[PDB]
Design a protein around this ligand. Structure first.
Ligand SMILES: Cc1nc(CN2CCN([C@H](C(=O)N[C@@H](Cc3ccccc3)[C@H](O)CN(CC(C)C)S(=O)(=O)c3ccc(/C=N/O)cc3)C(C)C)C2=O)cs1
Lengths: 99, 99
């Protein structure tokens, strides 16, 4: 589909069964998600945003549907404003910037 | 021009006679660069996100040169960790996500 940034590129995502509205973000490298429970074990990850580094959990190889395109991968979880799908999951669904 | 997301979407920009590198960020409400002197008056503002907030100066009606395309509109100045081009200026050069 073609999305125009006049608004926040917010889309529905399916992770673990529940639907969640996330933010498509070319700025972020990874996909950070809001506090939630997910399968398996997690590793520790430091990520520094516009306001500093925080500790987030990391579950690799996680199946998430993004706007209708099943993708499986690293999903960082921690204290984030909104859900954020980063390039790791953007390259999967085949996302691109065009102007 | 199709910009892939295998790496960070960094493109050269020109502002205030200067030349700086900046991350195309659809996940960025507005454009915000690192400390630099901008013309005009300004109103202070704060911005949240991963890590919290940061105080920034908000200069409006500012001309910018992205990839050659000329865009106009607000620009934030502050301790951001990297040069960010937001949706407010992206919409101008006509940028979009595709998959
Ligand atoms: C060190 C470095 N490390 C990286 C990679 N990194 C480091 C961290 N990171 C992601 C990340 O936080 N990306 C940021 C951009 C950014 C890029 C590089 C450094 C810092 C921030 C988002 O795309 C935009 N944010 C909104 C979002 C949080 C809702 S904003 O900046 O807070 C924001 C901007 C403008 C306004 C304006 N209002 O009006 C409001 C909020 C994390 C989630 C993983 C990333 O890709 C690059 S350099």
């Amino acid at each position: 589909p073609q999305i125009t940034l006049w608004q926040r590129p917010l889309v529905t995502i399916k992770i673990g069964g529940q639907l969640k509205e996330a933010l498509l973000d070319t700025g972020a490298d990874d996909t950070v998600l809001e506090e939630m429970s997910l399968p398996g074990r997690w590793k520790p990850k430091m990520i520094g945003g516009i306001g500093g580094f925080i500790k987030v959990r990391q579950y690799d190889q996680i199946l998430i549907e993004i706007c209708g395109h099943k993708a499986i991968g690293t999903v960082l979880v921690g204290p984030t404003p909104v859900n954020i799908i980063g390039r790791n999951l953007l390259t999967q669904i085949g996302c691109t910037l065009n102007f």
